[PDB]
């Protein structure tokens, strides 16, 4: 911890010589008072990623209310959500890219977006995402510009309540091409862990991670 | 063709002149995929027999708000799926809604 004594993300932690995935303490804006323990993915395409969503076995409940999605929940070594307030503070300290890793029955795919940011609470955590590359298909472009929606705070573009109807929480529009906080193992139309351009709306994905690191890292 | 009928259609007046209608996705889709839904409605016992068609934006938002309806008038509506090749599926059962005075 010498180049960056208070690394502000997993990329600076990796530059300090931490090259094994696991739990690390980062410091938002390099501030020792703003410590945050995160899971770092240090192997995917060179590493240095903060993981902020993991689905892998359906043990954790992702049908949670606005306060839970603002604050985060779950064991960061297992299934978890980092929290929207954290995501805003991280994506505001610089320019970050998004990576999504997907696995299902021995097949894998990924998507990278060159630009990814989440607004603060007063924007209702508005999503900005653009610049797709990868193999999973560009499903997040549909969600660009949307505020976050939970079953108890409907901000989506639909007449109905997307989060209530499709048993999750997301930057819903009307309603989704991505539903990675949906109901685990649920192959009913649009209800599961969906990435539309990879497996459609009637196939729930076994494993999914969303992660971020500085652009051009 | 296209699909079986939308299920469990329900409708409640929202305000004095609007109606909120919801339904469930057809259980069976035959070949082509569902692209959107049509909400078909007309006055039940009124003189204006204009047949109205509201088309939804996409296939996931299983609800619609109908505006510009007349108080003290009954309406009949049906929901139907429309597939990517333009074909209409089976129509839902008719639902009669009475707007209050
Ligand atoms: Ca809504």
Author numbering:
A (entry chain A): 1975 to 2191
B (entry chain B): 310 to 410
Lines quoted from the article behind this entry:
Overall, our findings provide novel structural insights in the interactions between RPTPζ and tenascin family members, prove that the formation of a RPTPζ–TNR complex is essential to the assembly of PNNs, and provide a blueprint to explore a potential role for a RPTPζ–TNC complex in neural function.
Crystallization trials were thus undertaken with the FN domain of RPTPζ and the Fg domain of TNC mixed in a 1:1 molar ratio. The crystal structure of the RPTPζ–TNC complex was determined and refined to 1.89 Å (Rwork/Rfree = 0.164/0.205). The complex formed by RPTPζ and TNC is almost indistinguishable from the one formed by RPTPζ and TNR. The single RPTPζ-TNC found in the asymmetric unit superimposes onto each of the four complexes found in the RPTPζ-TNR crystal unit cell with RMSD values of 0.717 to 1.107 Å (313–316 Cα positions). In the major contact site, R334 and Y368 in RPTPζ interlock with H2163, H2175, and R2151 in TNC, while Q369 forms five hydrogen bonds with S2164, H2150, C2149, and Y2140. Furthermore, the Oδ2 atom of D366 forms a hydrogen bond with the amide group of the N2148 side chain. In the minor site located close to the Ca2+ ion bound to TNC, V2133 is nestled against L329 and I374 in RPTPζ, while the carboxylate group of D370 makes hydrogen bonds with the main chain nitrogen atoms of A2132 and V2133. However, M342 in RPTPζ does not contact residues in TNC. Furthermore, the hydrogen bond between D366 and TNC residue N2148 (N1302 in TNR) is found in only two of the four RPTPζ–TNR complexes, while the bond between the side chain atoms of D370 in RPTPζ and T2134 in TNC (T1288 in TNR) is present in two of the four RPTPζ–TNR complexes.
